[PDB]
C-alpha cells in the first residue's frame, strides 16, 4: 500500500519528456501544487502518466503548450490539456471502451487501472482543446 508524492513524480516526467518535446516544438504550462500524497502504488500511476503525456504529444498541434495541472481538495486531479483538432461528442464518449480504437493508446486500461485505485478518468474536447482528467483519493 504505497504512498506516491504525485507532486515529485509529475514534477520528474514533465523534466524527463523535455527532449521528446522538441521535434513539435510543444513547452510545459505546469500548474503543479506541493506535497500531494496520493495512496496508490508509484510505478503504476508514472506508467499511467506517461502514456497521457505520450498520448498529449502525439494529439498536439505543434508550437503549442502542454498544461498539466495537479490540484488537491476533497480528491486528488490531475488535468493534462493539449491542443489539438476538436475530438466529436461521439468519440469522447467511447475513449475508455475496449478496442474503440480499433473500430491514443492505453485509454481503457488507464480507466480499469484508476477505477480499481479508487479513483476515475474521464475526457473532455472543444475548441481545438483536448482535456483528460484524472481523480485518485485523497489518504
Ligand atoms: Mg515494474
Same mark, same amino acid.
Given at each position: ?33 506541493? *506535497?500531494?500524497?496520493? !495512496?496508490?502504488?508509484? $510505478?503504476? #500511476?508514472? @506508467?499511467? =502518466?506517461?502514456?497521457?503525456? &505520450? ?26 490539456? *493539449?491542443?489539438?483538432? !476538436?475530438?466529436?461528442? $461521439?468519440? #469522447?464518449? @467511447?475513449? =475508455?471502451?475496449?478496442?474503440? &480504437? ?38
Amino acid at each position: 500500500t504505497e504512498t506516491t508524492d504525485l507532486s515529485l513524480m509529475l514534477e520528474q516526467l514533465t523534466f524527463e519528456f523535455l527532449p521528446l518535446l522538441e521535434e513539435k516544438n510543444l513547452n510545459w504550462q505546469l500548474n503543479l501544487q506541493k *506535497n500531494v500524497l496520493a !495512496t496508490v502504488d508509484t $510505478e503504476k #500511476i508514472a @506508467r499511467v =502518466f506517461d502514456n497521457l503525456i &505520450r498520448n498529449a504529444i502525439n494529439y498536439s498541434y505543434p508550437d503549442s503548450p502542454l498544461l498539466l495541472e495537479l490540484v488537491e481538495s476533497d480528491s486528488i486531479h490531475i488535468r493534462l490539456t *493539449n491542443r489539438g483538432k !476538436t475530438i466529436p461528442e $461521439e468519440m #469522447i464518449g @467511447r475513449l =475508455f471502451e475496449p478496442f474503440y &480504437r480499433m473500430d491514443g493508446l492505453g485509454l481503457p486500461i488507464a480507466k480499469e487501472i484508476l477505477l480499481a485505485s479508487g479513483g476515475d478518468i474521464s475526457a473532455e474536447s472543444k475548441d481545438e482543446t483536448i482535456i483528460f482528467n484524472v481523480r485518485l483519493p485523497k489518504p
